[model samples]
Target chain A: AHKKIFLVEDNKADIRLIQEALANSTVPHEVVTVRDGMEAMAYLRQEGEYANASRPDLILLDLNLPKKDGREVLAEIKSDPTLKRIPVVVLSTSINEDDIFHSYDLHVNCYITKSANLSQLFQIVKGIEEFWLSTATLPS
Target chain B: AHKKIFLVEDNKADIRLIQEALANSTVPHEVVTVRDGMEAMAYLRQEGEYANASRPDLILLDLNLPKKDGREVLAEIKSDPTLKRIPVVVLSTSINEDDIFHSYDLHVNCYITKSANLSQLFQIVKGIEEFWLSTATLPS
Candidate 1:
């Protein structure tokens, strides 16, 4: 089965790194990128410019963002009826305890810290595929 | 850092296989197992015989059980403010969409189907360690 992943990150460098990692994966999956939280919500809800955007099977969200923050986006997703079913994986650089606790409180599926090193980051991407793609069964 | 994983499954064969897989892992992790949902809660709550049970870093739960069903246990864990933060991976043989949707609605960290083959099952266990232990940062 092909998996559609929504990645919400503001950094172009991090997006490119994640794209490269996804390109290296053996699993058949697609990555849809949104640079900010507003765009992310738009993509998820198919609002305005993202009217044709496909519903994502999974989401990799960053805590910090332009416009609305990731925490706000996560709260909105988990609180929604149809959207709440999709797994949201929080991929952020924030090591702050409050961010971690708050994300969990908002019902994020998993929380991963963004690695500074490209090699380590690539390994983490593969780790996500190993669990979400190879092992875990996503909700239909 | 070492991780403590609580596995709640009634099947003896599956338990042995998971134990073997954990034993093979290079990362330092302790897998504490319980036979049923009642015992699982007791272990988590540290009640009765399990008064000294260490708090688990993660949980691998099987939906079908002897005393209380896994769904009930999951509901209990997610509803408890103190216990809800712990990530619970629902590992079951159920291919039903209802079960998957219900588990996600209950806010399970992730849902994984139990692989029938020995090697595949082992791989799934490794996959859990790869993501939850290696990549994802759990709340302390």
Candidate 2:
């Protein structure tokens, strides 16, 4: 079965890089993009235009986002019993210990700091695919 | 710095295979093994004989265990503020939907099923090293 991925990232370049990396995925997958935290939440809850949105098997979230921060979004998602089980991977550019520690505290499935270089970023996304998509078992 | 790994499993043969696989890890790592869920909790909490146990960067947990089950351990660890940050990967032989769903529901970082063949199990261990140790950033 094809896996669905919800990518919550504001950066266009990073989005493109992720798309490029996932384009070569061995497992059949789809990337549903949301530009901000609010949009992400909307998509997950299938609110408004997202009312028809499909539930994502995996979520890749960025820390810095407009409207609502990723941290807040993470808090909301993880605290919601119905939404909590879906794995949320933090893919951010922040190397701050607070960001890392706080994300973990919020029970993020995994936290990965994004690299500046596109090639390195691609590798990170590839690693995500190899592990989450190829190996780990996710809830249906 | 050497990465600390807390491995909670009851199977002697599987433990040995994991130890062997981790021994050849390109990343510097040390595995502290506990035979069952009780010892696993003790090791994590630094109780009794585990008074000097170092905090693990990661935890590899088996679903079925003596004394206590992995489900209880996962629930306990994820509920504790100090310990919840550490990622726990569930490695089990069971393909039962309940186990997978419940583990994820309890917020396990990832769930990986152990392959029947020893060679495949070794490869899965190697994949764990490649992703968790080499790729993802753990909470300190």
Candidate 3:
């Protein structure tokens, strides 16, 4: 049922790796990319570059970003009545306690620290997809 | 901030694995075991064996159990005035659609399928600890 996966990452290398990995995945997903928090908000709100964008089934967000940042976006989205139920997974390079805690406090579905190795990243992505998309039924 | 982990697992094998995995975890956690739904209720309610037990920072629960079961236990915990805001993670073998839907419907903090391997279990346990104990601030 989840046909779209929205990635909000500032790192071009990470984005490319995720794109390639997802392209190779067994499940075909319509992947959409947003460069920073501003674009992410635009996409989530279907404004500006994302005016005609299809609603995403999942959102992969990074903590550190230009403009609004992931923490603020997370809080805004989760607190919004129209967008709160959409599953958001925090994928960042941080293994920081503050980041993890604040993300969960803001109601992130899960927090994942992005690994350096490609295989590990793939595995983590696979697990995320399996757990969130396949196994658990999402909220409407 | 948080002291102990109340592991409400009906399965003996899961308890053993979790204990072994958590042995090497950074945050200190003492695994308190309860066998059935009734025992879990008793422990939470301080009925008998858990009369002197301290409040747990996190609760790891399974959906299916003998006697009261996790669903009813969860409902009771969430509905209770004093216990409503405590974080509860559903850890079970199967993540069936019905279980996921119903658990979320009942306002479970999060749901996680138990990993077969001990290391994966520990990783998940550690993530939960890092987020709930080390990071997030809780209400009194």
Candidate 4:
């Protein structure tokens, strides 16, 4: 019925904060959360237990996740023909040049640094909602 | 010193409008314009006259252009190892599903439609500025 957002993040604080920011968005959207890289891929691929998961229009990926590396997930998603079309935004805490460059090189749709400050993190999520959901034209 | 934006758009009026919108941005950026797809490739490749051209941090690409099609240019950029790191945002009048899907498949960083309304187009540039330059981390 509305836009679906697949959030792949391991940090509980960041996840709750992101949800709070999105809760106020003018755009109507449903968020599906997965706390680890394995869960993220499983949900995306609709594997085993995730057989009934909804296909998300946008995926907010965290570079560091439990079990599977975020970079590996990005590489896997971008290499898949059908999955590559869905936009993937990397929201990570790392400011490392190599990590940033590598994610872009892997064709991550956009890479945004995760803010440590509570208010700033909220603002980051707001910016994501405004630009991605309301502004950019996602493939339908 | 600041960010460099490579604008590959052919519409005379739209180009001027974009320049106007960017002028109000608080983030200082240098805008380099190329009217056709061939010029874009030449500039990116630093061929002949562009031998000393500055590498753009972000590229604002229009889908339709003279000479080489924008899609071809996108495919070329994403395929090139060195050039693929630079972010490419597609701004075009076409909202055709196939065109949007094709651009995403080509691994365009983002896709934005250029609305006919002046207000809409102005906001688009502002959104690009705020999201890309001010917020998102580009490869340095």
| Residue-level lDDT tens digits of model 3 in A4-38 | 88999978657755765676566687889888899
- Model 3 CA deviation exceeding 4 Å by range: B1-140
Ranking by lDDT: 2, 4, 1, 3
For each candidate, report its DockQ versus the true two-chain complex.
0.01, 0.01, 0.01, 0.01
In angstroms, give how far residue B10 of model 2 lies from its true place: 1.1
Alpha-carbon RMSD to native, per candidate: 18.9, 19.0, 19.9, 18.9
Please compute the TM-score of chain B alone for each predicted structure, in the order given.
0.95, 0.97, 0.87, 0.98
lDDT of 1 at A116: 71
lDDT (10s digit) by residue, model 1, range B96-136? 99999999999999999999997899899989878987789
For all candidates, the clash counts are 0, 0, 0, 0
Candidate number with greatest lDDT: 2
lDDT of 1 by residue, A1-34 (tens): 6889889998865776676577667877888898
Measured against the true structure, the TM-scores of the candidates, in listed sequence, are 0.49, 0.50, 0.48, 0.50
- lDDT for predicted candidate 1 compared with the true structure: 0.87
